Write an enzyme that holds these catalytic residues in place. Structure first.
Site, mmCIF file in Angstrom:
data_model
loop_
_atom_site.group_PDB
_atom_site.id
_atom_site.type_symbol
_atom_site.label_atom_id
_atom_site.label_comp_id
_atom_site.label_asym_id
_atom_site.label_seq_id
_atom_site.Cartn_x
_atom_site.Cartn_y
_atom_site.Cartn_z
ATOM 1 N N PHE A 2 45.363 36.922 -78.185
ATOM 2 C CA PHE A 2 45.040 35.906 -77.189
ATOM 3 C C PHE A 2 46.147 35.858 -76.147
ATOM 4 C CE2 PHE A 2 45.542 31.521 -75.673
ATOM 5 C CZ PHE A 2 44.313 31.322 -75.074
ATOM 6 N N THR B 1 43.184 32.302 -83.610
ATOM 7 C CA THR B 1 42.186 33.225 -83.083
ATOM 8 C C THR B 1 41.559 34.032 -84.217
ATOM 9 O OG1 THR B 1 43.361 33.443 -80.970
ATOM 10 C CG2 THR B 1 41.725 35.125 -81.502
ATOM 11 N N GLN B 2 42.345 34.954 -84.770
ATOM 12 C CA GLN B 2 41.944 35.822 -85.886
ATOM 13 C C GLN B 2 40.688 36.584 -85.469
ATOM 14 O OE1 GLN B 2 41.743 33.026 -89.056
ATOM 15 N NE2 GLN B 2 43.892 33.290 -89.656
ATOM 16 N N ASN B 3 39.688 36.729 -86.337
ATOM 17 C CA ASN B 3 38.511 37.518 -86.039
ATOM 18 C C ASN B 3 37.271 36.637 -86.004
ATOM 19 O OD1 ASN B 3 40.057 39.869 -86.019
ATOM 20 N ND2 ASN B 3 39.634 40.345 -88.169
ATOM 21 N N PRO B 105 42.543 29.127 -80.320
ATOM 22 C CA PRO B 105 41.520 29.094 -79.273
ATOM 23 C C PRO B 105 40.187 29.622 -79.775
ATOM 24 C CG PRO B 105 42.913 30.987 -78.942
ATOM 25 C CD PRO B 105 43.463 30.266 -80.150
#
Lengths: 213, 216, 199, 235, 198, 201, 204, 240, 234
Positions: A2, B1-3, B105
């Site tokens: 991000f 975030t991750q996946n 996010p």
């Protein structure tokens, strides 16, 4: 992952005249190689005597402005009066420091008239350092705007020439043409121009056409 | 975030006289797979405004449950007020901005249309928090494809009727299906007007394949 | 790992294989991946076997409470949203993916894929590492209004087809037919797997 | 007897004396009056001085561009709650970027006053409020109580000797709708006269007003603009 | 890298330290005092990270002054070293690790002189002589040859100068001026500051 | 950035450049780096500009709260120690601030230095900034505690002018502030280039 | 790794009616040696001792926390601790740190207070207690200390044969360890008395 | 005596008088009634006019907890709005949990459990408000539940809260409400409202009516002014 | 006793707040005066024995360069507020980089007056009301201003105000001596006249402290020299 920040381009100018203060910026909002819209006014009017420019990451430009407007009401409700241009500048310095670990990414420019009726231009940095100067610039074209105002406004590097204090008639035409020249070589500047002139009588807005490319 | 997985597709919207059209494909995408071919990507908010989005649809259903209950809670209040199309566009701007500071996010790109009191509103937000207002908007590759198509029309004809708008959408829905590999044939054209939001069912578009004979 | 469910008039048929392999070695070649969350409500385990068995108990803990408070069998939509929110909220530490299916007195047989954190209704749903290769059979050979005998064969033929192509799938086929009068549990031995083209 | 020691303990008739003592605290403050038309809204506030040499206290607090309020009750209890009202209104423009509906603000005021009641050890807020504001549906006059009850109102008068004003508000209620900004001030100042003693009546020093309207944002007047407003009004 | 050295005589403890405090490529303060006074007969020598050296040693300075004022009498040399080790060991696993190297010099009315070695890992070991920094490699070897428990301070100071003059020959960093003090029954006694009129 | 201060018989002299740049572009040439704390007490700036403006005002806050409390006109030693302790708690979080504190007290015109990691020093002559090493050369040459008032101005003037000539981050106009017993006073503000023309001839 | 910072060696062998424990005196940091007087064996009370090795930071720190639990245990109970009881105490102290575990390998040796019975044991970084019927050793050279005690140990050995065996095992195995040496302290725990001896060893 | 001081202290007869006094405060509240039928559930409330200075629509006594769930409260209006948002939080958290609308029996249980929790602690006070909860669905049907200040829910074909209750409950028993339709039930609701109110103490009031059922498509909806006036005229046919 | 600090009266007023104002009558008398040429403050040291040093008694404290302060009532509670008022005054200049208006000085201090409670508080919560009354004088962009606060926290702009035990007869005496344009030096004369009448002791140069602020001069405390010249004018 991000990416918390992205460069949205744009340009902001402020010049302090004798009795007046002029602030202008473009309407172009673009991220990457694509145009979001051709009308996105960055200039925001805090009080009658103060106008703040915002150039940088657009997400921080919107939130930080709403935070400033919230503290404008905190002041006025408490102190029964509007903030001076110098008081708004020193306020956002501590506002930008509160994020010192995760700083807001923005370039702020505050301008207007002080209690003496003289223009006060205030240029900032993401970490909150500030100074008072006659004229400042900002944004992607910031490197372009500064040399032109040094010769024309500052009368620098000129030997044996009459130095006349800045006039409003010339100050308008100087701000217009530096952006006309900016819109030529700046991919992030153009499509329209909005000029906000703060005088002792009041603020007067203007619109100037620019190339659509 | 991750996946996140649950990928979405492009969304288009535009302004015309007395209303807003927003259309999107019904296909959910997982990686390179087209998996769920029937999905409603256009959600109605009260009478006068409407919402659609892209990116992660699993995060979009969560935004359904959050924004949906909040909108319903107002209808439960019955105070005589309705969320303005600018209010929904404003709340999503801060709600998506609040997820960046917590380092969580949500992946999504949302478009807020609406028509209220003769004022036609169309607006754009993003995971990155970029927000503005434009007469024609698109997401993903639509901003590369369908956006300049509508800009040329709005410059020549700033005023567009309800029929001319839907005809331009289908022509834009036709182009987006061609050059977007992750797009899909079945789409829904939803239009908000003085009568409120009206969502049409599954639709298609007649394609011109004559390039097959012109190349060969 | 292959799980499959198909809705029909009188109920649903939810199949699964018995093979559980961590890595390239089989931990157990006979295992039931269907963990009952209720009488008619079942959950097809897939993804990570460790995280799926943990959610199945956390889901059963919440569903038994919701079932006893209403003193009636919970709706299939109720059991699906339990797995989804546990999936979506905890997806950070939980990679498991489940498929919720069952029968209720309201809409009858229902199948809700909870995979990846979203929720949608489907007439037939397939999941696991082996469900990717069976898209061809389940799409073309699916016909509306199939008898319970045809649905048992349609579900078996696709699972047996996954067991051939999927290296992580094998063992015996477990079938559960969930109807209004009860649930029937059947096991298909290796000799009873439908034979397909062998060449 | 022993049932007035706290809020939580109920009287044998099912009443809380501490809430009653909080509702009688508001009536010990200054008397203010307010009214609204189909267009504008006027809040007339009475200012008192602690002594003859002391300047008059401020009974008007600016909240939002379209919103204004007059405080009657304990001064500091209003100030902590004013910091709560302004924060919620700033949060409205911080989040929603729109003026907070006056009905939604007052609902948040009651929720703040419902918190101390049900818990032992925390005193209810003993300040009353007469708040006004303009929105898409027009001006609104709202009143709050330390009991957390809040009502929607055409016009109200709070404080001591308020019924002589409320009786005046009943007779002219028919005119309050169709009068314009200049007449609302005339009816508002004449409504304040009934709450006032028979000696000191009307001076621009201790009398201040505020006005919100259709396109007119809330504006506070003190002396210079109030002097012509008092002129031409016979008492 | 700063340097420390100490020597335990039969009735005395002889310690020395470099007075140079440098930053980047320049020496900012060459007279800097590295010696901190814990008690009357108890000194302290602290070197390490520029930030942890002054900060963590001042904590020990007052913590020892805490004990002396509460009970009316100062810590013994053995009691002082063992309390300073626990202080350094507690912050070892915290989020602010302290990199320091300490020598504790003190005299007792019963056990006599005591010298204690301490590393940045808070490992306390009693030794007749010890040194820190990279200069410890060029010095302590000389002490191995010339050290005896019966040595007199008159010869010890002369041998201490012979060790510190090696820092101006092989050891790269200048370190012009060294501070030397001694501890005995009669208290702290200052010695001539080592000066090299180069 | 070039900042320097030194103490002698007639008190401290603080000299600094005016230029602060970001990357290859000069942000502002006219920046005033010297911080005004108290009438007789004078601070400086080094490294990050915002870190100095934030923390030096906290020091000015502590010095004023002290004089309002005990009225003892806080010494330079107490001011330098309080500034160092505030940088110790946040050590490791990325705060970079240099500074130098100048002033006269009952002991004398003390000169101290506070680093980003909490290093507190005392001495006759200090300098900081990117051009500090260029300052040490000219300042040390021809310096004694017995220098007069006029002779020391020539040393402080040539210190900045010749140091900023060799540094790309140092420049602007020379701001030199002498320190006295009553308080510091502004001496002269002159462009570096204008003084370069007098030295070449 | 971290266990190789200070090195060190600890050896405990069980005899017939008695037990003997031995460890070297060396303390050094990597290539830099410090002092010859370092002590790896601390008294646990009558006829019970404990060895420690590895990082000396945890050697002196855990020795505190073991004496923390030892004295509190001895002051609460009216009887002395059994060597089997102390083994499980070290297991709890190391396991509570499971996220942050200490670096050390404690070695506990002594006699059963019942009558004559010797008891030995040793633990690991993970804090796993183990009871052996022959001997226990720990350190960086522990691979070297095995072969000596493997062949030399006998089912029953008198104090004459026990001291001669454990001493030769120390002198031979420690000489092949670079981080170990500089003298060996040997403790003999008998039923009647306790003998402490310092062996003559090479300085290297 | 000191036994009724705190709710945590039992009376000599084994009762809690603090809960009883909270019930006596409900008896001073205005009257609100409701009736369920095969077509749905009909709501009504007597909203007393305190002064002519109050705008139309002020002091709304018809509370909406959830899309299919209506509520009418008689008691302290401070504790009413408190539990109102709390009941909405339970319905919202339900949909955030199980993804649909909470059934009326399950919602009445969780709310009543939250009411009884404050009767146990002496550091808080019990609720002084009582309310009814209606709902309608195609699988369940018209349902009406009432929760008292003690936190106990009872299923009702009809209920009455406020000052006059037993008198209104007997008038409902005199005629079968099940086979009726919400169009005919609101005729009886307005008929009872005129019977309960006379001019002795109170001066004026306003009729606040609400419908849930087939007419409203199973969703909680207020009665429009056009139908309200026509429903009054049906009650204006009699009065007597 | 049988009540909390939050328990209301049958008239609806806090007992702890009522007794707080009643405790000011035991404090020291200080009389502030607001004039067009500045704000005058005067207070008596109240020396009950020659062994005490008058230097340790400061009843007039300086908040800012142009802002003064006065003191009465309980001494223990005032030293906490005098420090807190100073910090918030510098937090203003640390934020807005300007001198805080004396009205905002009274505003920030009035916030902490009624914060006191028992339940639902922090460990930094006050149990008992302030027993101190304060006078804030000073000069700002609006000119000389003199303000007053009580334990309840109400601050009011006042032309003249008196605090302490003698405030009963001093406030009534301020209305007599204050007429129209009366200057600072004339107000100093009238200040010593009223103060000498209300005190039980004799007026001396070192007995009272006198400090004034001006629009062209910072807040200044008159030393023993100037105090002898002021008392001479009586």
């Amino acid at each position: 992952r991000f990416s918390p920040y992205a460069f949205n381009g744009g340009t902001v100018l402020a010049i302090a005249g004798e009795d007046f203060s002029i602030v202008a910026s473009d309407t172009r909002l673009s991220e990457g190689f694509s145009i979001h819209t051709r009308d996105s006014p960055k200039c925001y009017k805090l009080t009658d005597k103060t106008v703040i420019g915002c150039s940088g990451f657009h997400g921080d430009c919107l939130t930080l402005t709403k935070i400033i407007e919230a503290r404008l009401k905190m002041y006025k409700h408490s102190n029964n009066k509007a903030m001076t241009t110098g008081a708004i500048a020193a306020m956002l310095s501590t506002i930008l420091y509160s994020r010192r670990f995760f700083p807001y990414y923005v370039y702020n420019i505050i301008g207007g008239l002080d209690e003496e009726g003289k223009g006060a231009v205030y240029s900032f940095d993401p970490v909150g350092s500030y100074q008072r100067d006659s004229f400042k610039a900002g944004g992607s074209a910031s490197a372009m705007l500064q040399p032109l105002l040094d010769n024309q406004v500052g009368f620098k590097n000129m030997q044996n020439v009459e130095h006349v204090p800045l006039s409003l008639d010339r100050a308008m035409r100087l701000v217009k043409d530096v952006f006309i020249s900016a819109a030529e070589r700046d991919v992030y500047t153009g499509d329209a121009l909005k000029v906000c002139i703060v005088t002792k009588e009041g603020i007067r807005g203007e619109t100037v056409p620019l190339r659509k490319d | 975030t991750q996946n996140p997985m649950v990928t979405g597709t492009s969304v288009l919207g535009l302004k015309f006289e007395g209303g807003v059209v927003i259309a999107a494909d019904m296909l959910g995408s997982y990686g390179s797979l087209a998996r769920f071919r029937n999905i409603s990507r256009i959600m109605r908010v009260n009478n006068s405004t409407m919402l659609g989005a892209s990116g992660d649809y699993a995060d979009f259903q969560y935004l359904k449950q959050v924004l949906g209950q909040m909108v319903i809670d107002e209808e439960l209040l019955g105070d005589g007020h309705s969320y303005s199309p600018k209010a929904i566009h404003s709340w999503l701007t801060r709600a998506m901005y609040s997820r960046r500071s917590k380092m969580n996010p949500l992946w999504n790109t949302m478009v807020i249309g609406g028509y209220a009191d003769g004022e036609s509103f169309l607006g754009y937000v993003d995971m990155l928090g970029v927000a503005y207002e434009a007469p024609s908007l698109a997401t993903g590759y639509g901003a590369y494809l369908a956006q300049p198509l509508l800009r040329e029309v709005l410059e020549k004809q700033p005023v567009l009727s309800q029929t001319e708008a839907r005809e331009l959408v289908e022509r834009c829905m036709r182009v987006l299906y061609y050059r977007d590999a992750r797009s899909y044939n079945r789409f829904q054209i939803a239009t908000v007007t003085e009568k409120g939001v009206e969502i049409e069912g599954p639709l298609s578009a007649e394609t011109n394949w004559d390039i097959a004979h012109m190349i060969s | 790992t292959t799980i499959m469910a198909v809705e029909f008039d009188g109920g649903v048929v939810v199949g699964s294989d018995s093979r559980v392999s961590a890595g390239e070695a089989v931990v157990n070649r006979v295992f039931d991946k269907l963990s009952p969350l209720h009488q008619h409500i079942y959950c097809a385990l897939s993804g990570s076997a460790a995280d799926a068995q943990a959610i199945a108990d956390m889901a059963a803990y919440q569903l038994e409470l919701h079932g006893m408070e209403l003193e009636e069998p919970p709706l299939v939509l109720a059991a699906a949203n339990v797995v989804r929110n546990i999936t979506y909220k905890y997806r950070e530490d939980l990679s498991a993916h489940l498929m919720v299916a069952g029968w209720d007195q309201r809409e009858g047989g229902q199948v809700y894929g909870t995979m990846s954190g979203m929720l949608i209704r489907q007439p037939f749903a397939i999941g696991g590492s082996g469900s990717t290769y069976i898209y061809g059979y389940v799409d073309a050979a699916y016909k509306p209004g199939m008898s319970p005998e045809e649905c048992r064969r349609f579900t078996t033929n696709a699972i047996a087809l996954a067991m051939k192509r999927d290296g992580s799938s094998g063992g015996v086929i477990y079938l559960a037919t969930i109807t209004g009068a009860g649930v029937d549990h059947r096991v298909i031995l290796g000799d009873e797997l439908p034979r397909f083209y062998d060449e | 007897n022993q049932y007035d020691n706290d809020v939580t303990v109920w009287s044998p008739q099912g009443r809380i004396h501490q809430i009653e003592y909080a509702m009688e605290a508001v009536k010990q403050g200054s008397a203010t009056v307010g009214l609204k038309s189909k267009t504008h809204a006027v809040l007339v506030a009475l200012k008192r001085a602690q002594s003859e040499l002391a300047a008059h206290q401020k009974k008007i607090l600016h909240v939002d561009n379209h919103i204004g309020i007059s405080i009657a009750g304990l001064t500091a209890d209003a100030r902590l709650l004013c910091n709560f009202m302004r924060q919620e209104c700033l949060d409205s423009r911080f989040v929603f970027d729109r003026p907070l509906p006056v009905s939604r603000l007052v609902s948040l005021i009651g929720s703040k006053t419902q918190i101390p009641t049900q818990r032992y050890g925390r005193r209810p807020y003993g300040v009353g409020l007469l708040i006004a504001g303009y929105d898409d549906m027009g001006p609104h006059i709202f009143q709050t109580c330390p009991s957390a009850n809040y009502f929607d109102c055409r016009a109200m008068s709070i404080g001591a000797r308020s019924q002589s004003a409320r009786t005046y508000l009943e007779r002219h209620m028919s005119e309050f709708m169709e009068c314009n900004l200049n007449e609302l001030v005339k009816h508002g100042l004449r409504a304040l006269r009934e709450t006032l003693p028979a000696e000191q009546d009307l001076t621009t020093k201790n009398v201040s007003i505020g006005i919100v309207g259709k396109d007119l944002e809330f504006t506070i007047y003190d002396d210079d603009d109030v002097s012509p407003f008092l002129e031409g009004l016979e008492e | 890298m700063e340097y420390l050295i100490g020597i335990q005589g039969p009735d005395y403890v002889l310690v020395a330290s470099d007075r140079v405090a440098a930053s980047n490529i320049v020496q900012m303060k060459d007279d800097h005092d590295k010696m901190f006074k814990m008690s009357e007969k108890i000194l302290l020598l602290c070197v390490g990270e520029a930030g942890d050296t002054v900060q963590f040693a001042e904590y020990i300075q007052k913590n020892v002054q805490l004990y002396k004022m509460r009970n009316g009498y100062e810590l013994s040399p053995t009691a002082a070293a063992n309390f300073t080790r626990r202080n350094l060991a507690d912050y070892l696993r915290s989020r602010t690790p302290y990199h320091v190297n300490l020598l504790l010099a003190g005299y007792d009315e019963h056990e006599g002189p005591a010298l204690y070695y301490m590393d940045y890992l808070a490992a306390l070991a009693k030794a007749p002589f010890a040194a820190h920094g990279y200069g410890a490699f060029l010095t302590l070897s000389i002490l191995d040859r010339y050290y005896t428990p019966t040595i007199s301070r008159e010869k010890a100071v002369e041998l201490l100068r012979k060790c510190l003059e090696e820092l101006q020959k092989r050891f790269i960093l200048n370190l012009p001026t060294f501070s030397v003090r001694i501890i005995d029954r009669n208290g702290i006694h200052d010695l001539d500051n080592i000066s090299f009129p180069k | 950035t070039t900042t320097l201060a030194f103490k002698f018989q007639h008190g401290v002299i603080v000299a600094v450049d005016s230029r602060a740049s970001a990357g290859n572009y000069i942000a502002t040439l006219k920046v005033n780096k010297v911080i005004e704390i108290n009438p007789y007490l004078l601070g400086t700036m080094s490294g990050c500009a915002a870190d100095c403006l934030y923390w030096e005002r906290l020091l000015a806050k502590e010095c004023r709260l002290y004089y309002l409390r005990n009225g003892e006109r806080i010494s330079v030693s107490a001011a330098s120690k309080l500034l160092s302790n505030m940088m110790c708690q946040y050590r490791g979080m990325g705060l970079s601030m240099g500074s130098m504190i100048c002033g006269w007290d009952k002991k004398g015109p003390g000169l101290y230095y506070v680093d980003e990691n909490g290093t507190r020093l005392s001495g006759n002559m200090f300098s900081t900034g990117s051009g500090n090493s260029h300052a040490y050369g000219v300042m040390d040459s021809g310096y004694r505690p017995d220098l007069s008032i006029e002779e020391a101005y020539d040393l402080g003037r040539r210190a900045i002018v010749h140091a900023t000539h060799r540094d790309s981050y140092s420049g602007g106009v020379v701001n030199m502030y002498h320190m006295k017993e009553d308080g510091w006073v502004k001496v002269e503000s002159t462009d570096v280039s204008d003084l370069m023309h007098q030295y070449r001839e | 790794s971290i266990m190789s910072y200070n090195g060190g060696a600890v050896m405990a062998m069980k005899g017939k009616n008695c037990v003997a424990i031995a460890a070297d005196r060396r303390f050094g940091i990597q290539a830099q040696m410090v002092t010859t007087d370092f002590q790896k064996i601390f008294p646990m009370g009558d006829r019970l001792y404990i060895g420690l090795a590895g990082l000396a930071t945890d050697v002196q720190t855990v020795a505190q926390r073991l004496k923390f639990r030892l004295n509190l245990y001895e002051l609460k109970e009216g009887r002395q601790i059994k060597p089997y009881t102390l083994m499980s105490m070290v297991a709890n102290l190391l396991y509570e740190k499971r996220f942050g575990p200490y670096y050390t390998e404690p070695v506990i040796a002594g006699l059963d207070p019942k009558t004559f019975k010797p008891f030995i044991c040793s633990l690991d970084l993970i804090g796993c207690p183990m009871v052996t019927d022959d001997f226990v050793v720990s350190g960086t050279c522990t691979e070297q200390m095995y072969g000596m005690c493997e062949s030399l140990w006998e089912p029953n050995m008198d104090p004459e044969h026990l001291f001669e065996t454990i001493s030769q095992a120390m002198l031979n195995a420690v000489d092949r360890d670079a981080v170990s040496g500089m003298g060996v302290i040997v403790h003999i725990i008998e039923k009647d008395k306790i003998t402490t001896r310092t062996l003559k060893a090479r300085m290297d | 005596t000191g036994y009724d001081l705190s709710a945590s202290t039992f009376s000599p007869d084994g009762r809690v008088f603090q809960v009883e006094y909270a019930m006596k405060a409900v008896e001073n509240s205005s009257t609100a009634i409701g009736i369920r039928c095969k077509d749905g559930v009909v709501f009504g409330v007597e909203k007393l006019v305190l002064s002519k200075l109050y705008e139309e629509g002020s002091n709304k006594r018809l509370f909406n907890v959830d899309r299919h769930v209506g509520m009418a409260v008689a008691g302290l209006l401070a504790d009413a709005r408190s539990l109102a948002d709390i009941a909405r939080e339970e319905a919202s958290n339900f949909r955030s949990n199980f993804g649909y609308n909470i059934p009326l029996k399950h919602l009445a249980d969780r709310v009543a459990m939250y009411v009884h929790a404050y009767t146990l602690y002496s550091a808080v006070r019990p609720f002084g408000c009582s309310f009814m909860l209606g709902s309608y669905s195609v699988n369940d049907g018209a349902q009406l539940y009432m929760i008292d200040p003690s936190g106990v829910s009872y299923g009702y074909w009809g209920c009455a809260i406020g000052k006059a209750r037993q008198a209104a409950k007997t008038e409902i028993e005199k005629l079968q409400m099940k086979e009726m339709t919400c169009r005919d039930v609101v005729k009886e609701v307005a008929k009872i409202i005129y019977i309960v109110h006379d001019e002795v103490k109170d001066k004026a009031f306003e009729l606040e009516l609400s419908w849930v059922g087939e007419i409203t498509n199973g969703r909680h909806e207020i009665v429009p002014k056009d139908v309200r006036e026509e429903a009054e005229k049906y009650a204006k046919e009699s009065l007597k | 006793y049988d009540r909390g600090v939050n328990t209301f009266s049958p008239e609806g007023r806090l007992f702890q707040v009522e007794y707080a104002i009643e405790a000011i009558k035991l404090g020291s008398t200080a009389i502030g005066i607001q004039t067009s040429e500045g704000v005058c403050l005067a207070v008596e040291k109240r020396i009950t024995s020659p062994l005490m040093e008058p230097s340790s008694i400061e009843k007039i404290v300086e908040i800012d360069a142009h802002i003064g302060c006065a003191m009465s009532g309980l001494i223990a509670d005032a030293k906490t507020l005098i420090d807190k008022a100073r910090v918030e005054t510098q937090n203003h200049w640390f934020t807005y980089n300007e001198t805080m208006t004396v009205e905002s000085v009274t505003q920030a201090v009035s916030n902490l007056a009624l914060q006191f409670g028992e339940e639902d508080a922090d460990p930094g919560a006050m149990s008992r009301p302030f027993g101190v009354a304060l006078l804030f004088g000073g000069v700002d962009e609006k000119g000389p201003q003199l303000f007053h606060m009580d334990p309840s926290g109400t601050f009011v702009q006042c032309d003249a105000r008196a605090i302490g035990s003698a405030s009963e007869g001093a406030q009534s005496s301020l209305q007599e001596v204050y007429h129209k344009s009366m200057t600072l030096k004339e107000a100093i004369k009238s200040s010593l006249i009223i103060l000498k009448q209300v005190m039980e002791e004799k007026l001396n140069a070192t007995n009272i402290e006198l400090a004034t602020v001006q629009p062209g001069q910072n807040f200044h405390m008159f030393t023993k020299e100037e105090l002898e010249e002021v008392i001479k004018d009586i």
